[PDB]
Design a protein around this ligand. Sequence first.
Ligand SMILES: [Mg+2]
Ligand SMILES: [Mg+2]
Lengths: 780, 778
Amino acid sequence: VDVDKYTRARNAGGKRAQDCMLLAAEGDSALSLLRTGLTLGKSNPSGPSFDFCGMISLGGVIMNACKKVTNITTDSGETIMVRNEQLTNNKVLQGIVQVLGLDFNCHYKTQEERAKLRYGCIVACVDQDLDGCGKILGLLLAYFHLFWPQLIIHGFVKRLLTPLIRVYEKGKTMPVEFYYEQEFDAWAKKQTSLANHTVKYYKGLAAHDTHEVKSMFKHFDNMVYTFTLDDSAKELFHIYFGGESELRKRELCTGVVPLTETQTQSIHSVRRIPCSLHLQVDTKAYKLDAIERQIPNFLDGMTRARRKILAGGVKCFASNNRERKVFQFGGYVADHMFYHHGDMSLNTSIIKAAQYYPGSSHLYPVFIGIGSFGSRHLGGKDAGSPRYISVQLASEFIKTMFPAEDSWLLPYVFEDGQRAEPEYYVPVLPLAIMEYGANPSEGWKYTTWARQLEDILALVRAYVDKDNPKHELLHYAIKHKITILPLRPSNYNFKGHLKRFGQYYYSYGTYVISEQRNIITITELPLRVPTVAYIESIKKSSNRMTFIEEIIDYSSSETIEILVKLKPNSLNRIVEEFKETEEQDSIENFLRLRNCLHSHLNFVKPKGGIIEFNTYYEILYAWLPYRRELYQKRLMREHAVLKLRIIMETAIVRYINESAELNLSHYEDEKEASRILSEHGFPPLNHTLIISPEFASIEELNQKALQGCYTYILSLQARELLIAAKTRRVEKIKKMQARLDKVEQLLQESPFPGASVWLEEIDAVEKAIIKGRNTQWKFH
Amino acid sequence: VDKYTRARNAGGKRAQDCMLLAAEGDSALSLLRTGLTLGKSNPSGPSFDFCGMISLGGVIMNACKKVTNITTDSGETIMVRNEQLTNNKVLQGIVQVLGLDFNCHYKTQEERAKLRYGCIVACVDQDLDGCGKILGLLLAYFHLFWPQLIIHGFVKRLLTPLIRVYEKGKTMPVEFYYEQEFDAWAKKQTSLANHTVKYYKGLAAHDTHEVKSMFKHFDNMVYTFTLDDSAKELFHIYFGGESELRKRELCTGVVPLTETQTQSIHSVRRIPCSLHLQVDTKAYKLDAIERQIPNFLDGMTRARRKILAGGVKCFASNNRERKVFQFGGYVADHMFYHHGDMSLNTSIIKAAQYYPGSSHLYPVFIGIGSFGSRHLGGKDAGSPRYISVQLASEFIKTMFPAEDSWLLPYVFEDGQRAEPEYYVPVLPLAIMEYGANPSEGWKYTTWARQLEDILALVRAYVDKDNPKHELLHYAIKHKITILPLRPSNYNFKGHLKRFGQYYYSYGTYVISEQRNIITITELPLRVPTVAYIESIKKSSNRMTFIEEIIDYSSSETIEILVKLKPNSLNRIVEEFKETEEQDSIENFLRLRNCLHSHLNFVKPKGGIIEFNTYYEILYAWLPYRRELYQKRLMREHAVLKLRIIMETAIVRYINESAELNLSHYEDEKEASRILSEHGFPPLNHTLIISPEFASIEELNQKALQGCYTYILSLQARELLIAAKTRRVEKIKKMQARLDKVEQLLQESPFPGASVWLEEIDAVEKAIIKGRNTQWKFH
DNA sequence: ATGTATGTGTGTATATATACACATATATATAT
DNA sequence: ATATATATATGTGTATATATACACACATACATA
Ligand SMILES: [Mg+2]
Ligand SMILES: [Mg+2]
């Protein structure tokens, strides 16, 4: 059959079969670009066309064959390699072995067996972000390595090389092109002003308009590169794409190793790429980026997408907290936070970042959700479409947990030249250990179970507050890493019971036995167990089905009530079949009613890279000093700003008192007015930095403050030359200097500066959490 | 059967005690399954012991257009279906669920107890699409096959709110069920500054306390359909295969509902089918005509007008690119769009496209990325996460002037302004582009006119020194034509011929008998290439003469190459005959088509209008633009006089405030007193300096009745000598402009006759500069 | 040589569907 | 009693698919005496 989304060349499998190309693209918008470009008729006499080029789609992400295949060493000696039934029945790989005419029991070592291919090179036209240049190009290389390495030896697998970033200067008709994101960031941070450049990001090939696809296809054969492999490559394919992760963990801790001048000149001159040198840059950079996207930071407890959602949601609902649809808020946060990915997964994260039900992931959600957001009974998988449902910002919890005057003092993620969101938030409470979570990633796994709220409040109040009895003893335990105050799992919104048997916790359900009608009434499932998955699991097991007649659900939307029915006189035969250990009952062995709480505390740290803890105490002890130094920073910044504002307004007061004697109307322009104001003892000030010190560090704030002009005094309205305005300004100067005395008294106290403000914020976060838990997280 | 939650008692001893809540999608089933499980928060509600769920799958197929009554020998017409209607997966589901039988009639109760449920209950949306269209099609299906169940109370429905309004303080909302009821309500108010209007698009947008208060009163809000005797004619008009009944009905608006009928419906809790079809279905069909047929003034539909308004609002600060889905989120937020996102993004994509043969010859946007080609008909664009749009800023500035948009009637959604009723362009843009749509009752199809003909017509109307001025005025008086009006052959390399009462368009071939090759070098107007090539391969009458067909096309240029089997040209010449209207080779290769028009537009203040020729559309267009120039000049004259009055108090206050000494006074009331005791005029400063949407009556009615904010909010920067000098020359420039405004209010033929000539010239050179740069504006 | 039925096609609407990667604990079905 | 494939599920990503309404000029497929 002609396979799906396939355009053959006119010379496939004929007398000039070997000189034809297959430009295998990633989707269909890329094929739309390739169809646009291979049909430059007389505007490109040196370019390719469909006389010797074809097109086929890779279907998204290629299946890997390096872990769906098995070796069988034959008794003749020569081992054989049998595929899986899933790998045999993939449509994309069946399609491309149908197009090129490949064979699985031909090694393609001589040339009269390589002349029986339908056309003799593959060229992968993929993207340049790490998701497409590193991942699926690596899996394609792995497929051709695992089944026919002789074609990678002789030269059969090729690729284009397109730009990811173009930067256009005003005036010049040649842009500056970049192939990697960190190269752009290193180029851009060295600059001094980027307000005459335009930065374009090209996710996918279909973002290239006409006047640059013509430039890309005047030089088509100039940018095709061919792969070679050496002996140092087979172990790297087994590390990066083999069935064991310990190799991948121990390689994937270290960062990417940059490229030498000889290797770079050799690649950009002779245009061949070593497969191992591709794996040790592009695929490794992909896997580090995937770790950064899919594993939470240990300070704020959230991923990178959810941190963009939080920043864009604080900024979106700023003026008035009116709700919007999920797709409209998603368009906002993809516009203003520089989100460079697809739109469907962003809307899925906005939906799941607002759910609240017994057993949801987030116990303290950022948003209030307005509509239908799914239930326990399908695990939140049955929410509405984003067309229907709405979200708004849970404003007082975000006000108390993430204080707004601390978001000025954080390191930010700069994207495309201007800032997007923080590197990390630092909440008032250790929010990384307060919720649930279970993800895979590259190399590692993330799994947490939430802690009690009162345990965490006891530990933080024991650390900070000086007259709690557990003050110095807790500091001793932080010096020696021993545990004193208990840190239990959370039992909120869960009615079953929890037991510790050795080095793990176990969570149990609740049944209700009856011999009057031989019916067991299940009333609760263990932690984070969906209902219909439990019912189908208890229905598939044939050893358990021999004792039940009918299994019926009567549960409400927030409370479990399952009803089984037993076959007559079958309560007795369960006990000999399903034996009762001390750790679980015979019914709880029978009805699948306990689970183990097994944690994988693998986080990412500031400045990137994995970190791996052994207990929740280690995460708390790593979290506390960041909040300590952030309090010290905000108090010193406030001290500097208050001195400078006293200095500013106690010259406005004397200008109001001396404007009649000064006679400002007599003078000609701003030059003579600034000169006659410099002679009467008015300080030159920087009005913008004093009114709005946005992100200015304290050296920046006292370094460019006294280097301004008299704009603070010259934009005074005649409204405020009145006597009630004088009284108002004098009393606000008195309040500012009283605040300055309070600030310089707060900078000294025990055990560290800013130790009472943080206790006040603990109490504020606690009452906001209590109010939210009472109102079903609606904050009525 | 998928998406079907079986009730516990379906098909048993108490099967007739059971309901089937047929919802419309899957989010609706999420709502209904949330509602039917309030176990002890709703002890008087329903549950799954007597209630099922099933999905209607979007929009129901109709059977009235897909069935045949065939007459047999015995004297009876049996009703035999179609193979397409028989294989519809949604209707197969409900027939298998309810246990219906097609050859039964269910007249007796012994037959009406052989079913599996007791009633079908349509839980549909309350917006006009779901309440009118698919509920009428469900009624039409049950009428066309089993009218005796509509007689005996089998088809039921819920009744939900469409708009809830929440008063501050009070604990009961106001619920409106129709949109025009809320619009007439909200126009009556004077202060809607503290009410929160909630639009509920589908029923899955309903919050938890709202669904609790809707499921405590479930049987309070179910209704039942009663079948009339006049209903057969209404079911044949609205859903039958004859369109002229539907044209003849749907001119006049919806008949309002009386008080006796209202009290009967809300009291005995039953619905006549005819009273439903003449309100809900008719209101839907009028709404679909409004959404799917253009206005003859601006040329654009409702969605494209929202997209242009949101694009002018979005790209105002800088003309920075956005994606398609991000700009779509913007225009769905600020222009109050109440529909899905996929259709809006498709509308933005097709509003940005520009290729030879696209719908728009003068697009609103500049498209950046892959926006499709001639060959697949523009259906080969990118996904909306890839491609970008940008505002074609100077064309939008010249065609739709910004100072005219303050003086237009607007549309209110939910209280706030969203977008105009129409734009009034400088050129008649409704006859300058293409289009081919169906709708309810009517068809829309246009073919664009030459630009030069339209420019000559409008310059003959407006300019008094043009020697075809009074002739054209006589022709407007007596409805005759003088000046030609040809179709647009721009970017088309075939040729056009007028034969009788229509134009035909012809493509170009090139023949060579030395190789038996015909080379097609041009297709007719708006013919996709791959659709043409696959259409020529299905005709086996033509396949017996050709061997091989190869496409060598460019990105924007056609080049098709056929191959003939030997000794078959003479058989083509003698077999496909030649008339004097089309060649034999063009008869063989499908190389002409007719430019056949259906000029059916909507008019202002709602309603269809149907024209006969393009001259009627031009002559209807001209007086709106004329009157709009007159009222913008009146507005400018008023604002200039008021601003002269405002600044010739500020300048003398700068002259006299050195000894007036306002720094001596206590507060602003004493200052306002002493300013009014020296002759300064009280002014409304926030409406003199920014008249946004104030008419001239409320401009000269409430602006001299303000305060002294204009004079008390001056910065001390303003009190210098250079600022005095600049205010003096600015007063001089406003005085000169006021003299020019009063000088050109009185000109001939009508006020503002040279200004519209200048805007003609600016739009024409912007169109030229956009055609030279492939509509990229380099 | 006519009276029939089908059959895509355009814009603006209504409601859905699917493949793949990644780690690890649990569950299921044979084969020494 | 035991190894060994196979299957599933979680979040953040990469790609695509498909049913219905509405009007009418036009094209292709057997019947019509
Ligand atoms: Mg991509
Ligand atoms: Mg609807």
